[PDB]
């Protein structure tokens, strides 16, 4: 006698008329990381420069930006650094070596006195904005300045707020919008390779270093250098596989840029410099400042990697039911409340298990009750079902939820759905299929072409 909310699952594949998930959400950075999917996503599609980059923006990019931005990734064989960023974010433990680094560097941050200066942007992506109020608490010597609205790349929302912030908090320490890339072209020998990178601004002083992210360039710095260069040397290189810089073929692992960022440094002959680092970039710049500690003077940073615990996130999903989604949970919640006052009893679920084929005692229809009622009066209002779904929502993966699932379909538990089975099970939680509509459901599910489903094949469907 299964719990409610495999019922409500069971319903929303009829609904969908297709066997499977039907709340899979989507995700997105999770497609990026998982075998064969993220790499057709970011190398063959290029859905990292084409979708992610201008939903990194809250005002739209304009055509001539999109086009410097794609410059560097025209070739498909070009993408790899795109695609093994995102696969080295520290989400959710994984992969452990960054996320154990990006602890340290963290770690070292709460305890250096380095003069900080954090920009952030509602609603954010890495670093929301209760995320940013936290950290201008704890982090030592910090300065927060809210930028209005912005996402990842704050850059292209808030350029003359950033810039002129940072010009300021640069003459109080110790030391020394535009579409148009004026800035004249700087190579460095690196590692065998030659790195691109701008340098404008007087030559002698405490030179600042600004560091991109993934999938930028110094591009992204445009509109901030001309507020620091009038008094202090600028230099923003484009990161290996990035940019104008050479793409040697590489893995393009944090490691790699770590390499290539270090070598940089030590070709240009940089003693102490002031950071301004974002994305990954932060990431290069927060790990070179916690090895390099009395050669850094300041850090300006926005929208940088920290370990993100979870993919339950202000990033990768919110706490927000859609609207469709709601109205459906509601024509669910319809078919147990038949007589319409708004709760639902043990008779009602009684009545629509009896409709299933089954039996249930009125213990076993108050424990079920049990599982979805979170205030103890006994009955089960539209809140406390919505609860019940948000939270199948994330796991409808479990094995014995499948198995759950699978029961309910197959009504006369022999191990097969049929034909007949689908339309008793649907016509009762008030899905109404027409044969055509059956037939293809079993049909997408049926690999040995039998007319009916049986249990690996329902769990083939289920965890595609
Ligand atoms: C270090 C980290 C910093 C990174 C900074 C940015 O991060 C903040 C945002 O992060 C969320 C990322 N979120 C997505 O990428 C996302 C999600 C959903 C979709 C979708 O399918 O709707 C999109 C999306 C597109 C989305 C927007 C597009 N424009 C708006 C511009 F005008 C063009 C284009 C595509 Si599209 C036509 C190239 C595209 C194609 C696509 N394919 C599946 C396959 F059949 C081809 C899938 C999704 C899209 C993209
Ligand atoms: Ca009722
Ligand atoms: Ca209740
Ligand atoms: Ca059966
Ligand atoms: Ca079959
Ligand atoms: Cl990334």
Redesign the pocket.
Same mark, same amino acid.
């Given at each position: 006698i299964p719990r409610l909310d495999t019922l409500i699952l069971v319903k929303a594949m009829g609904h969908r008329k297709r066997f499977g998930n039907p709340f899979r959400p989507?995700e =997105? *950075?999770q497609? *990026?990381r998982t075998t064969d999917v993220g790499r057709? +996503?970011i190398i063959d599609?290029? #859905? !990292?420069?084409? /979708? =992610? $980059?201008?939903? /990194? #923006?809250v005002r739209? $990019?304009t055509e001539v930006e999109?086009d410097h931005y794609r410059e560097p990734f025209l070739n498909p064989v070009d993408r790899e650094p795109l695609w093994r960023?995102?696969n080295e974010?520290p989400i959710a433990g994984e992969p452990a070596n960054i996320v154990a680094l990006v602890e340290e560097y963290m770690d070292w941050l709460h305890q250096s006195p380095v003069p900080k200066l954090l920009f952030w942007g509602t609603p954010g #992506? $890495?670093i929301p904005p209760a995320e940013a109020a936290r950290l201008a608490k704890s982090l030592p010597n910090c300065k927060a300045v809210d930028i209005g609205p912005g $996402?990842? +790349?704050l850059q292209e929302d808030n350029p003359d707020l950033i810039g002129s912030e940072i010009a300021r908090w640069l003459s109080t320490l110790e030391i020394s919008i535009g579409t148009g890339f004026p800035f004249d072209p700087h190579y460095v020998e690196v590692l065998g390779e030659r790195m691109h990178y701008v340098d404008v601004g007087p030559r002698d002083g405490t030179p600042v270093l600004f560091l991109h992210?993934?999938?930028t360039s110094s591009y992204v710095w445009r509109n901030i250098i001309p507020h620091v260069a009038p008094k202090h040397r600028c230099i923003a290189p484009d990161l290996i596989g990035m940019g104008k810089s050479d793409k040697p073929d590489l893995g393009y692992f944090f490691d790699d840029h770590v390499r290539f960022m270090d070598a940089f440094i030590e070709a240009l002959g940089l003693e102490e410099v002031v950071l301004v680092i974002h994305?990954?970039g932060s990431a290069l710049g927060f790990h070179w400042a916690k090895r390099n500690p009395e050669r850094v003077k300041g850090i300006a940073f926005m929208?940088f990697?920290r370990p993100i615990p979870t993919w339950d996130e202000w990033? !990768?999903a919110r706490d927000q039911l859609t609207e469709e989604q709601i109205a459906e949970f509601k024509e669910a919640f319809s078919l147990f409340d038949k007589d319409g006052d708004g709760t639902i009893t043990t008779k009602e679920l009684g009545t629509v298990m009896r409709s299933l084929g089954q039996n249930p005692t009125e213990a076993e229809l108050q424990d079920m009750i049990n599982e979805v009622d979170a205030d103890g009066n006994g009955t089960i209002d539209f809140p406390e079902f919505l609860t019940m779904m948000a939270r199948k929502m994330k796991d409808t993966d479990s094995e014995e939820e499948i198995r759950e699932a699978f029961r309910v379909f197959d009504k006369d538990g022999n191990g097969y759905i049929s034909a007949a089975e689908l339309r008793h099970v649907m016509t009762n939680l008030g899905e109404k299929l027409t044969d055509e509509e059956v037939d293809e459901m079993i049909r997408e599910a049926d690999i040995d072409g039998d007319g009916q489903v049986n249990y690996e094949e329902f769990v083939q469907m289920m965890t595609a």
């Amino acid at each position: 006698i299964p719990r409610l909310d495999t019922l409500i699952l069971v319903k929303a594949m009829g609904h969908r008329k297709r066997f499977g998930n039907p709340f899979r959400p989507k995700e =997105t *950075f999770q497609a *990026f990381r998982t075998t064969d999917v993220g790499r057709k +996503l970011i190398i063959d599609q290029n #859905v !990292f420069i084409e /979708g =992610t $980059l201008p939903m /990194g #923006v809250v005002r739209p $990019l304009t055509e001539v930006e999109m086009d410097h931005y794609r410059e560097p990734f025209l070739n498909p064989v070009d993408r790899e650094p795109l695609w093994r960023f995102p696969n080295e974010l520290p989400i959710a433990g994984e992969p452990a070596n960054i996320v154990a680094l990006v602890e340290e560097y963290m770690d070292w941050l709460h305890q250096s006195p380095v003069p900080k200066l954090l920009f952030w942007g509602t609603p954010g #992506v $890495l670093i929301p904005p209760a995320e940013a109020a936290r950290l201008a608490k704890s982090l030592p010597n910090c300065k927060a300045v809210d930028i209005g609205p912005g $996402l990842n +790349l704050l850059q292209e929302d808030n350029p003359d707020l950033i810039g002129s912030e940072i010009a300021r908090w640069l003459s109080t320490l110790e030391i020394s919008i535009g579409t148009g890339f004026p800035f004249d072209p700087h190579y460095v020998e690196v590692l065998g390779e030659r790195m691109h990178y701008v340098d404008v601004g007087p030559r002698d002083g405490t030179p600042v270093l600004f560091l991109h992210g993934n999938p930028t360039s110094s591009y992204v710095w445009r509109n901030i250098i001309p507020h620091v260069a009038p008094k202090h040397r600028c230099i923003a290189p484009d990161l290996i596989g990035m940019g104008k810089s050479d793409k040697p073929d590489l893995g393009y692992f944090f490691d790699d840029h770590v390499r290539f960022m270090d070598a940089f440094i030590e070709a240009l002959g940089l003693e102490e410099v002031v950071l301004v680092i974002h994305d990954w970039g932060s990431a290069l710049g927060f790990h070179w400042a916690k090895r390099n500690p009395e050669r850094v003077k300041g850090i300006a940073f926005m929208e940088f990697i920290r370990p993100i615990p979870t993919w339950d996130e202000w990033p !990768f999903a919110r706490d927000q039911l859609t609207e469709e989604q709601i109205a459906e949970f509601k024509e669910a919640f319809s078919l147990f409340d038949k007589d319409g006052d708004g709760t639902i009893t043990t008779k009602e679920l009684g009545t629509v298990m009896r409709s299933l084929g089954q039996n249930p005692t009125e213990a076993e229809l108050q424990d079920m009750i049990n599982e979805v009622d979170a205030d103890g009066n006994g009955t089960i209002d539209f809140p406390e079902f919505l609860t019940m779904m948000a939270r199948k929502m994330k796991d409808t993966d479990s094995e014995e939820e499948i198995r759950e699932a699978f029961r309910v379909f197959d009504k006369d538990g022999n191990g097969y759905i049929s034909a007949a089975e689908l339309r008793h099970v649907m016509t009762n939680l008030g899905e109404k299929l027409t044969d055509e509509e059956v037939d293809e459901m079993i049909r997408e599910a049926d690999i040995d072409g039998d007319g009916q489903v049986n249990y690996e094949e329902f769990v083939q469907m289920m965890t595609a």
